[PDB]
Write a protein that binds this DNA or RNA. Structure first.
Ligand SMILES: [Mg+2]
Ligand SMILES: [Zn+2]
Ligand SMILES: [Zn+2]
Ligand SMILES: [Zn+2]
Lengths: 264, 773, 183, 86, 133, 196, 43, 65, 114, 160
RNA sequence: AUCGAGAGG
């Protein structure tokens, strides 16, 4: 198809995609996992101002949870980082503002969910700031539960951010990396009481590659261009978009280096 | 006692310490708020006016800043609130209290303060985070470990004070300890383990890692080393990059066990010109002990190169280990089933022997032992039985332990772990001892309420068969708790007693300093020592060397050191000396050689008199072997050519060198005699190390090389002389004090109690004894 | 526990018995006719011993020591010396009861060395924790409370009586043992 | 004590400068340089007083005489230039 | 700029040692009583087979930063399968009329003894060891 | 600190991409040194990591009760049935390189406790501060902005080093420097001096 | 809190050292460290 | 106090699971690990955050104020 | 308190040059480039692509401390070749490979039906 | 005691020797007994050695005992430090303690002695004694605040 | 301030 790296997806899902990376240097794949973890932009609440708190949970606690709450970021490239924007505090294009009030009307403790949070700022026809709920009930992630006689009343400002700045902005939770599953490269030396094969289970990624034969000598020149990877999405950004944004973000970083050289 | 000896001091800070690989050994990581709060008064100079104006503009909030400005009148100008804060323009003679900046001298101190090594000058590097950052190598003299440890920083306020701190108290200067004649700082923990693993011949480094490690050495030659293996693939041994880290021109040889030139064990090290030929890097090579690479680097070039070497070794080794990794694990403690069966069998055989001895005691068919009660003999035999059982079990464990075992890797590196740790973890923790005894029956005839009465078995008396992995029984756990309780109480008591003892020693010896006449004297002038240390030489730069004249066969000593020009066999072979054919006969030269031989024989008799043991190695001023090695590598003599050097000139030059070294300058016959007494053993060493026969046999020294060796020996001895004014008594007291803290516990008073009796000069003695010969 | 002679006339046995434990367990579940520890003391199945009284008694750690013992053994199990005692007056209810509350917190201290256990007891007094549920109502001079207290993954049996699992003071952090970056 | 003059020829104090002597000389020269003292050595890219003091010591320009003292009190005065630095 | 020495060496025994990747080789000059050698080699790069006869060659040449082969136009110095670079730790004489040379190649060590070589061999830090199958 | 006597400070804080990662992607919240353990000789910490891994996979709480006999081999057998290594060593990859770590690293869940002591409360820095009147010396404690006290042992250490002027500056300029007027005839502060 | 509530204090032969009579009544390992180690015990 | 939003080690959301997890273990009398498998959290870093956590907030709620 | 802000790691401040180029001393064609506010992620790939180029003799990444996100790369190239040109060609190659991978992955996902 | 001695060849060879160990010390009578070497006999207690043989022998035995404790540690302290302490006790004819009874009771100095122990008693006896302090002592200078005659402070620097 | 207690290395 295309000269250079080739990708064969083993498994597809909304949450996760498992793929096989071929004709790739390891350094680029490591850099891609790192740009996927850290650099990809996301929308999470950066400011919380609460008027009334009757919750047993402290305000700082709830604010940290709210920052950890997932918000949609597919159109986050249309959204702008507030520091790049000229508004004094926030404009409608750079910040998405959520309001949430929850009282304990019921004697039974009343749960507070991400679906209860609502947006006051204008959508401008972009899929930004929607609370993310994978729960089958549709009930949002619970911030607090409030006994009768308790009301909580707060506003939240969500700005563009990156996971290097704070872990809440990470689109992906875990990235699975595998290379040299058969240990032909012998990058790792097995610690074995009696036998290494008995002591270390064969990975699922060994069986795809052809098993090594004990007859042939080890090749010093050989380097592994085939890797087995898996990407898991929180849901704020779809998996294909998450990995594509990792690729693109690394490309923008490289281009920024190049244009800095041109300015020099 | 409190306020005058020790004051609460301005410009003093305190912080929790953490360890940073990248920060240089002399540097200290000073928190930004600490530097901002701390002020150094700097008089405004024509060079610094621009910088100081910029600092004042930047302000107290942001460093580089200045908190206060002192006028020529001296009225305080406060930067935080001033109507002229932006108005001021610097005027000469003013003082700016600058914020503490990078590469500025301070003092870093640990509260036990047993040693001068606990208080050392440090370069400042301002760090972002809150904890004091320091190098790992400086932990050992500071006696600190990163478990909430807290250390103090003191800032000089005067330029003379700064110069004192930099010229005397600097970390590279105090690298070598005066006491124990060894450097204080060595490569510790992961750097030592990693340098060992890198130095293994199995370990090989690819060109990408090689280039990154080359770059990692802050000063790199720029030349990629030629690969150890080229044609199959350009493989590089870790020893080669490590050698690129080793400074050029320094040569070390260490012979341990079977240090064959082939060295299949790879034990020992050979380095020439800072390039390692053979070896696996071990703790002693990189250790604080003398004969280590640190001492050689400190002596040959200086302290600064040594500290830089610490840094470079740390960086390269930490990068390589970072890629390789390391993990102690459960399984490194676990042991094979077969070895475990042998372990249990060993313990069982010990128990069977103990029960048979107990039966023989019950039968009263036990031989009378002179000077001890028969019960005492029984107790000693059972205790020794259990001790041997535990030790043999540990030996079985270690042999069972693979080369991959990480505790074994630390022990081979020497960084951590002990044989006893492995034995307790895998086979048997041992037999608990309380008050120097097996566990006693608190209940009448029963050590524990579960135990039956009158049981003298090791399980009743507290021997723990089980390892730490298998787990202690409740009785074993209680007895081990008794032992640990005694350990903690003894530790606290030892700390208190040693603090008092150190203070008494310091107060008794403090006033005595080497005066300008080189006589060790108190303030009143009463001479403690006419020549300090009886040789008049600084305790630093003194390394143990072997005197070849002492010991050995008289015939062998004659063969190595005697050359007779008259006998054909005795005269040197003409390949050794161009004069040699002319030398045959030459009776007037033979009489000079006979005179030097008579001097060697008298010196041998004297040294045999000094030590009945006649131990070869004793602390000595100048290491001759290193000088000879440096000469051989500097002049690159093939040793095929006959020596340029006259047979007369070796003897006359050695005599001239003896005349050249004076501990005391004065031309007083008493002072001359005392000087000869001071350098008597050194002269013996010099004559033994370089005999005419030896000078031509051990090497083909060019006459220029022998002259260079003579000049270097003279210079080194003059370096080794004690600096006048040095406060010797405080150093002596601290020298006793820190090891005295370190000591932890055939029936004689020992350790702190024995020391306390010695210091109190008390008539009563807990354990008097006469050694009848 | 008290060991007396020939329960069911067979062999010197513990005074307690499985049906008594079943009734006590039924009372614990109902939380009928109460079965209490004080009731056990009135039954005489258990006795309180002072140290002076302790000198005169003979104790067995494990109730399995008393039953008659007329082979293959897993190597990992710690070696136990045979009690080899005819008569035991009493049996210790559990060895772990000699340990303290802080020692009851300590995991596998039998496998650990004792001085480290002492250090950990002191540190556990020092460690942060939610002291009480009413802390928010309370006004203490200094209060430190974990955001997300996590019950320990490895718990002593004594912990269910310690209520440490109910009110934990530490977090089950994922720990790796490695030499990485030299920090 | 009084007129405890020592002949310059008949001096038994060590020719080499004591490390304390060098430390105090460097500190005093740097302290004076910080207080706008004249500098007798040509300087290249040096602003720190202590660097100038060290360079002056290598140049032996400092006109200071260390007075060696003895337990009796006789004083042996050595110029910085006379003393070897090594 | 020419080879110092060439021979055919038949190895009776190879000892793996503690190391797996590196084994020591005990060989002697084939049909010559005079030369015997013990050399540390890596078996993964080239596997020494027991009872092999392998061609041994030491060459002085064919500072300067090592350059990866800039192109194929730069010609490989040797047909030999194995080449190492290293410096001699010692030049000794076993007994009168018997010289020995101890060369270290990357910490790996080789000792080979024989009279005629000492006129060839010099105290040169440079050495290239060339093993042919 | 850990539940087995191991105490220590946080050397550094690392982002997840920088920290070593297993094939599962699990990044340890905490990274410790292998070297602390052999001298401390606390096998129970390692056993706790193994048991907690077994408990996390099984969903059944593990018992670490003293004097209860549990086989390390049995716990390792359960880990083997889970597929995780019996020793619990996990193949890791270096975070910066993406390269596989040469040695497998022990990866476990360990109960860890946050100690009361925190650095920012501990830090104190005084250049100039309030002084007790009679001592004319720095007050004591952070709360009073009070200076550290140089020890008598510290003064002795400085005598050993030999810096007289530094000890004079710390001894006088840093604390209770004072100027007095005294008379020549009697060595007492009898003289009362008016300077204007 | 619990440990403070169960406290022993011995005001001041060998009181600090753990004793056989302590078994079953006092924790073997709970004690202050450094100063007053074993004088104070936990039940 | 309350259910964490995400597991600290990797960051998968665990706030959504808690109510469902309790309902599963009560409804099927399920083993806790089996309920974790139904939750879809297969990594012990995700499992520990659910299993180790105790809701202190319920007891805090029981207080009248 | 003293700890630096997170933001400083990804934005350049006080007009910091993203790349500072200084000729290396004692090496003829080498040059040290200080990437500022840059991390290991970019640097490892840049060095690997520089190693792939035949003309580059030397390339390596070093960071002086983990606290500060500065990445230092020294480049040695064949004579007649600009090290800066080598770096730019390696960077452009990086971008082309990433684009090709993105297209192939997108095609495979369009084939995937989940 | 497995002593080593010169051989007839001159090489050092170890010959086992018989040695007796006594729980008690009566040096004067023990040394004047047949069947023993008078020169070789040694006492655990140094004071009896000093009274029987002289002060210098006592100093040697004192250094040996301190060496024994440092070897029980396994630590090595250089000969000069321990030697200096032994000489400070030995130069005074009576063997002097490191405690206040002894070195503090010694006349030299006035404020160092009070700094160690019995501060007020020394000051009172000094006022009654009218002793004049030279102020040479380092501790006395530290009390004075004047720079002590430390190595750096010892020499006096003047202009040319 | 003092005294006391506790805790840290
Ligand atoms: Mg500590
Ligand atoms: Zn805006
Ligand atoms: Zn007067
Ligand atoms: Zn997770």
């Amino acid at each position: 198809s295309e000269e250079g790296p080739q990708v064969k997806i083993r498994e597809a899902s909304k949450d996760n995609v498992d793929f096989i990376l071929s004709n790739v240097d390891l350094a680029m794949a490591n850099s891609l996992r790192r740009v996927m973890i850290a650099e990809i932009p996301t929308l999470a609440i950066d400011s919380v101002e609460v008027e009334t708190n009757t919750t047993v949970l402290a305000d700082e606690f709830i604010a940290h949870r709210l920052g950890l709450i997932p918000l949609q970021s597919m159109d986050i490239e249309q959204l702008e980082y507030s520091r790049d924007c000229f508004c004094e505090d926030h404009c409608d294009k750079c910040s998405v503002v959520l309001t949430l009030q929850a009282f304990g009307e019921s004697e039974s403790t009343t749960n507070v969910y991400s679906k209860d949070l609502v947006i006051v700022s204008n959508l401008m026809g972009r899929n930004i700031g929607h609370p993310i709920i994978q729960d089958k009930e549709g009930n949002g992630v619970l911030i607090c539960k409030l006994r009768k006689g308790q009301e909580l009343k707060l506003t939240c400002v969500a700005k563009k951010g990156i996971a290097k700045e704070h872990a809440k902005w990470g689109p992906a939770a875990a990235i699975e990396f595998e290379y040299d599953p058969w240990n032909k490269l012998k990058h790792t030396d097995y610690w074995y009481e009696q036998d290494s094969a008995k002591e270390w289970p064969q990975s699922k990624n060994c069986e795809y590659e052809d098993p090594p034969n004990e007859g042939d000598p080890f090749d010093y020149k050989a380097q592994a261009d085939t890797f087995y990877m898996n990407v898991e999405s929180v849901g704020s950004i779809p998996v294909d978009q998450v990995v594509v944004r990792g690729i693109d973000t690394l490309q923008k970083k490289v281009a920024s280096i190049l244009l800095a050289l041109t300015q020099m | 006692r409190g306020n005058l000896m020790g004051k609460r001091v301005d410009f003093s800070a305190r912080t929790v310490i953490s360890g940073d690989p990248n920060l240089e050994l002399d540097q200290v990581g000073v928190p930004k708020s600490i530097a901002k709060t701390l002020t150094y008064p700097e008089v405004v100079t024509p060079y610094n006016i621009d910088r100081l104006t910029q600092l004042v503009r930047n302000g107290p909030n942001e460093h580089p800043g200045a908190k206060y400005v002192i006028r020529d009148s001296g009225d305080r100008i406060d930067l935080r609130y001033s109507k002229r804060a932006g108005d001021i323009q610097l005027q000469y003679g003013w003082k700016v209290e600058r914020h503490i900046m990078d590469n500025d001298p301070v003092l870093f101190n640990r509260q036990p303060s047993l040693h001068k090594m606990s208080m050392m000058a440090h370069r400042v590097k301002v760090i972002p985070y809150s904890t004091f950052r320091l190098n790992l190598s400086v932990t050992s003299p500071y006696n600190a470990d990163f478990d909430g440890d807290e250390m103090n920083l003191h800032v000089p306020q005067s330029e003379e004070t700064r110069a004192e701190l930099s010229q005397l108290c600097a970390v590279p200067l105090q690298i070598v300890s005066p006491q124990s004649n060894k450097p204080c700082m060595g490569i510790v923990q992961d750097t030592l383990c990693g340098i060992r693993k890198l130095t293994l011949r199995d370990t090989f480094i690819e060109l990408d890692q090689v280039l990154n490690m080359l770059y990692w050495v802050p000063d790199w030659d720029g030349v990629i080393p030629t690969p150890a293996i080229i044609k199959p693939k350009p493989l590089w041994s870790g020893k080669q990059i490590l050698s690129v880290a080793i400074p050029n021109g320094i040569h070390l040889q260490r012979f341990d066990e079977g240090t064959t030139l082939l060295s299949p064990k790879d034990n020992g090290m050979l380095i020439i010109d800072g390039q390692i030929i053979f070896g696996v890097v071990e703790k002693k090579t990189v250790g604080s002990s003398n004969g280590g690479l640190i001492h050689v680097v400190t002596r040959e070039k200086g302290p600064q190169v040594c500290a830089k070497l610490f840094g470079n070794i740390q960086k390269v080794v930490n990068f390589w280990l970072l890629h390789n990794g390391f993990s102690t694990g459960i399984g490194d403690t676990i042991a094979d089933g077969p070895t475990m069966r042998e372990i249990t069998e060993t313990i069982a055989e010990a128990k069977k022997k103990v029960l048979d001895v107990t039966k023989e005691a019950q039968a009263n068919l036990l031989t009378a032992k002179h000077g001890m009660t028969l019960r005492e003999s029984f107790e000693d035999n059972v205790v020794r039985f259990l001790n041997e059982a535990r030790d043999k079990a540990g030996r079985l464990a270690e042999v069972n332990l693979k080369d991959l075992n990480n505790v074994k890797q630390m022990v081979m590196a020497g960084s951590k772990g002990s044989f006893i740790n492995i034995a307790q973890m895998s086979a048997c923790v041992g037999q608990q001892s309380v008050e120097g005894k097996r566990i006693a029956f608190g209940f009448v005839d029963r050590t524990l309420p579960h135990f039956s009465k009158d049981d003298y078995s090791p399980e009743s008396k507290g021997f723990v068969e089980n390892s730490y992995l298998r787990g202690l029984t409740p009785q074993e756990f209680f007895f081990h708790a008794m032992g640990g309780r005694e350990g903690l109480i003894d530790t606290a008591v030892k700390t208190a007693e040693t603090g008092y003892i150190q203070r008494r020693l310091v107060k008794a010896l403090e006033d005595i300093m080497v005066h300008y006449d080189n006589t060790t004297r108190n303030s009143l002038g009463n001479v403690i020592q006419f020549i300090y240390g009886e040789d008049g030489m600084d305790a630093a730069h003194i390394e143990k060397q072997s005197l070849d004249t002492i010991g050995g066969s008289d015939a062998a000593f004659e063969k190595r050191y005697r050359v007779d020009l008259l006998n054909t066999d005795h005269t040197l072979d003409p390949s050794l000396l161009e004069s040699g054919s002319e030398i045959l006969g030459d009776l007037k030269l033979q009489v000079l050689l006979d005179e030097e031989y008579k001097q060697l024989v008298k010196d041998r008799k004297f040294l045999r008199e000094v030590f009945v043991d006649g131990e070869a190695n004793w602390p000595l001023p100048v290491n001759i072997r290193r000088i000879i090695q440096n000469a051989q590598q500097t002049f690159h003599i093939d040793h095929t050519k006959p020596s340029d050097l006259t047979i007369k000139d070796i003897v006359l030059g050695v005599k001239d060198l003896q005349e050249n070294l004076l501990v005391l300058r004065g031309k007083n016959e008493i002072i001359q005699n005392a000087q000869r007494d001071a350098v008597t053993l050194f002269c013996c060493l010099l004559r033994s190390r370089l005999a005419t026969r030896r000078v031509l046999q051990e090497y083909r020294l060019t006459k220029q090389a022998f002259d260079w060796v003579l000049s270097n020996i003279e210079a080194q001895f003059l370096r080794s002389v004690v600096h006048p004014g040095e406060m010797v008594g405080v150093l002596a007291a601290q020298s006793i004090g820190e090891p005295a803290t370190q000591m932890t516990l055939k029936k004689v008073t020992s350790g702190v109690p024995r020391l306390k009796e010695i210091l109190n000069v008390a008539k009563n003695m807990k354990t008097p004894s006469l050694t009848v010969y | 526990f008290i060991v007396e002679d020939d329960e069911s006339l067979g062999h010197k046995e513990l005074k307690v018995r499985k049906g008594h434990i079943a009734k006590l367990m039924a009372t614990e579940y109902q939380d009928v006719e109460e079965y209490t520890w004080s009731s056990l003391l009135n039954e005489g199945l258990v006795e309180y011993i002072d140290a002076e009284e302790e000198e005169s008694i003979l104790i067995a750690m494990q109730p399995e020591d008393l039953e008659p013992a007329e082979l293959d053994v897993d190597p990992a199990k710690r070696i136990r010396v045979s009690h080899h005692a005819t008569t035991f007056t009493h049996c210790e209810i559990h060895p772990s009861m000699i340990l303290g509350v802080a020692a009851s917190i300590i995991p596998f201290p039998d496998h650990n060395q004792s001085p480290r256990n002492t250090y950990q007891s002191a540190m556990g007094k020092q460690a942060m924790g939610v002291f009480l549920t009413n802390y928010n109502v309370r006004m203490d001079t200094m209060a430190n409370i974990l955001y997300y207290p996590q019950k320990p993954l490895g718990t002593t049996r004594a912990m269910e009586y310690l209520k440490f699992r109910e009110l934990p003071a530490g977090q089950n952090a994922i720990v790796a043992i490695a030499c990485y970056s030299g920090y | 004590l009084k007129e405890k003059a020592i002949p310059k020829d008949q001096r038994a104090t060590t020719p080499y400068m004591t490390k304390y002597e060098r430390a105090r000389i460097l500190g005093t020269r740097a302290l004076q340089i910080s207080m706008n003292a004249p500098v007798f050595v040509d300087l290249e890219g040096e602003t720190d007083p202590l660097r100038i003091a060290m360079k002056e010591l290598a140049e032996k320009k400092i006109p200071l005489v260390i007075r060696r003292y003895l337990p009796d009190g006789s004083f042996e005065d050595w110029s910085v230039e006379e003393l070897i630095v090594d | 700029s020419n080879t110092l020495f060439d021979d055919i060496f038949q190895v009776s025994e190879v000892d793996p040692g503690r190391y797996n990747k590196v084994c020591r080789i005990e060989a002697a000059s084939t049909t010559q009583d005079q030369c015997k050698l013990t050399l540390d080699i890596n078996v993964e790069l080239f596997p020494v087979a027991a009872q092999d006869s392998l061609t041994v060659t030491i060459a002085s040449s064919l500072t300067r930063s090592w350059r990866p082969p800039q192109a194929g136009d730069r010609s490989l110095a040797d047909d030999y399968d194995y080449v190492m670079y290293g410096t001699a730790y010692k030049f000794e004489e076993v007994s009168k009329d018997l010289i020995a040379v101890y060369y270290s190649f990357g910490g790996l060590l080789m000792r080979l003894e024989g009279n005629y070589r000492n006129l060839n061999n010099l105290k040169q830090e440079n050495a290239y060891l060339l093993i042919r199958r | 600190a850990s539940r087995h006597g191991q105490k220590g400070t946080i050397g550094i804080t690392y982002r997840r991409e920088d920290m070593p990662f297993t094939a599962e992607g699990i990044v340890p919240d905490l990274i410790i040194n292998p070297h602390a353990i052999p001298s401390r000789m606390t096998v129970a910490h390692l056993i706790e990591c193994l048991l907690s891994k077994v408990a996390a996979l099984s969903g059944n709480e593990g018992d670490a009760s003293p004097f209860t006999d549990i086989t390390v081999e049995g716990i390792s057998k359960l880990l083997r049935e889970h597929g995780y290594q019996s020793r619990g060593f996990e193949v890791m990859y270096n975070g910066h390189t993406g390269k596989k770590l040469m040695a497998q690293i022990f990866f476990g869940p360990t109960y860890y406790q946050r100690l009361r002591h925190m650095v920012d409360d501990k830090i104190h820095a005084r250049a100039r501060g309030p002084m007790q009147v009679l001592t004319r010396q720095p007050v004591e404690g952070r709360s009073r902005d009070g200076g550290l006290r140089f020890g008598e042992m510290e003064r002795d250490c400085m005598i050993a080093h030999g810096a007289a002027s530094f000890l004079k500056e710390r001894l006088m300029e840093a604390s209770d420097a004072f100027r007095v007027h005294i008379c020549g005839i009697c060595g007492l502060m009898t003289v009362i001096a008016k300077l204007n | 809190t619990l440990s403070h509530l169960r406290r022993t204090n011995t005001p001041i032969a060998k009181p600090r050292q753990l004793h056989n009579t302590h078994w079953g009544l006092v924790c073997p390992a709970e004690t202050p460290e450094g100063q007053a180690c074993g004088l104070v015990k936990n039940l | 106090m309350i259910v964490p939003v995400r597991c600290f080690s990797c960051g998968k959301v665990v706030g959504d699971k808690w109510e469902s997890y309790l309902n599963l273990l009560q409804e099927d009398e399920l083993d806790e690990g089996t309920a974790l498998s139904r939750l879809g959290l297969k990594r012990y870093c995700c499992r520990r955050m659910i299993l180790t956590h105790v809701d202190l907030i319920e007891k805090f709620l029981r207080y009248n104020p | 308190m003293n700890a630096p802000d997170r933001f400083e790691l990804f934005l350049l401040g006080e007009g910091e040059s993203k790349l500072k180029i200084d000729p290396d001393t004692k090496a003829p064609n080498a040059v040290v480039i200080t990437f500022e506010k840059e991390d290991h992620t970019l640097g490892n790939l840049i060095r690997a692509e520089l190693l792939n180029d035949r003309k580059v003799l030397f390339a390596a990444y070093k960071v002086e401390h983990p606290f500060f996100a500065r990445f230092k790369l020294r480049i040695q190239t064949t004579e007649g070749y600009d090290p800066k040109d080598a770096l730019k060609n390696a960077c452009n190659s990086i971008i082309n490979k990433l684009g090709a991978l993105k297209t192939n992955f997108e095609t495979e996902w369009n084939l995937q039906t989940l | 005691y497995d002593r080593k001695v010169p051989s007839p060849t001159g090489e050092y060879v170890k010959e086992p020797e018989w040695v007796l160990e006594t729980d008690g010390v009566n040096l004067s009578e023990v040394m004047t007994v047949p069947g023993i070497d008078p020169t070789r006999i040694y006492t655990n207690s140094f004071i009896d050695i000093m009274e029987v043989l002289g002060i210098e022998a006592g100093r040697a035995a004192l250094y040996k005992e301190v060496y024994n404790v440092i070897a029980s540690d396994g630590s090595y302290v250089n000969y000069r430090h321990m030697a200096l302490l032994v000489d400070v006790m030995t130069t005074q004819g009576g063997l002097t303690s490191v405690t206040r009874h002894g070195f503090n009771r010694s006349n030299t100095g006035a404020l160092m002695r009070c700094s160690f122990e019995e501060t007020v008693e020394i000051l009172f006896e000094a006022g009654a004694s009218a002793e004049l302090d030279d102020c040479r002592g380092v501790s006395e200078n530290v009390i004075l605040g004047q720079m002590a005659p430390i190595g750096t402070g010892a020499f006096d620097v003047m202009i040319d």
